[PDB]
């Protein structure tokens, strides 16, 4: 997440390994059932796209479902682009780009950039947007199994 450090400023705190292990456990025992969704949301509060991807890639052994979730995310990422045309121009020092779907998904965006979009007045909540795409994919695979 992005937390206040020991010095009060907004920083990237990584994700807790035990919270990751807790997620892995939930999916290992319960599998992708309706119960796994409230859990994921609860364990991903404040998470960056990178943190959300860490949670997904730690799921060691649910291949067909993970491919289904990935496609759903990629669809939502493609929808974002279609609904969000980019303003041409060079980016100046100090600021950054408009995030594309691939950026919100963390595939073409650094943690530094995601933190930048999140820590903005008023922000591009790339963590909360991506999480919504993941929750929709979860609902899909949660009704498949």
């Amino acid at each position: 997440p992005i937390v206040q450090n020991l010095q009060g400023q907004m920083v990237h705190q990584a994700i807790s390994p035990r919270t990751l292990n807790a997620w892995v456990k939930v999916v290992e025992e319960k599998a992708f059932s309706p119960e796994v969704i409230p859990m994921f949301s609860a364990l991903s509060e404040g998470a960056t796209p990178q943190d959300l991807n860490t949670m997904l890639n730690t799921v060691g052994g649910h291949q067909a479902a993970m491919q289904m979730l990935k496609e759903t995310i990629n669809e939502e990422a493609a929808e974002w682009d279609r609904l969000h045309p980019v303003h041409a121009g060079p980016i100046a020092p100090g600021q950054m780009r408009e995030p594309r779907g691939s950026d919100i998904a963390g595939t073409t965006s650094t943690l530094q950039e995601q933190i930048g979009w999140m820590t903005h007045n008023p922000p591009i909540p790339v963590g909360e947007i991506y999480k919504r795409w993941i929750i929709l994919g979860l609902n899909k695979i949660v009704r498949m199994y």
């Binding site: 303003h87 041409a88 121009g89 060079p90 020092p93």
Partner: protein, 165 residues
């Protein structure tokens, strides 16, 4: 001569500011120089004349060329739509550098920017295809109507443009 020269007659809220002229390096980037040249003469029936500089950032660059949507999310080339990054042989070496304002790799339409500084981090991302021949003082005058996000405080337009000699 191989490289063509074009001019812009800049106006501020209708009032004439002055003329900027450009040399286009058709010897290095012919397809990109040609696009800009033809859009300056208006020989295709459309182009820069009457269009505005919608994004001006002091110390960075002046951006224009969006004659369709006027807001950064438009413009089109003389090739129909968006054409490839021709090459990145030339660099953003200082003020006066004329370069293509794209929205990613191979998204060249009509939008361009004139650097008001050395913008080295733009090398390999934006195609350099010309430089101000005369009127850098007009560009410096233009950037005084800019702002931190690019929003211009006054309507900065290309009152007239064409090819010289």
């Amino acid at each position: 001569m191989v490289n063509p020269t074009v001019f812009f007659d800049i106006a501020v809220d209708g009032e004439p500011l002055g003329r900027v002229s450009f040399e286009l390096f058709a010897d290095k980037v012919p397809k990109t120089a040609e696009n800009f040249r033809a859009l300056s003469t208006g020989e295709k029936g459309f182009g820069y004349k009457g269009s505005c500089f919608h994004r001006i950032i002091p110390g960075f660059m002046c951006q224009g060329g969006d004659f369709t949507r006027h807001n950064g999310t438009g413009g089109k080339s003389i090739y129909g739509e968006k054409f490839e990054d021709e090459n990145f042989i030339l660099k953003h070496t200082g003020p006066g550098i004329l370069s293509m304002a794209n929205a990613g790799p191979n998204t060249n339409g009509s939008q361009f920017f004139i650097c008001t500084a050395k913008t080295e981090w733009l090398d390999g991302k934006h195609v350099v295809f010309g430089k101000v021949k005369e009127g850098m003082n007009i560009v410096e005058a233009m950037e005084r109507f800019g702002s931190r996000n690019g929003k211009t405080s006054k309507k900065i337009t290309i009152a007239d443009c064409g090819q010289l000699e």
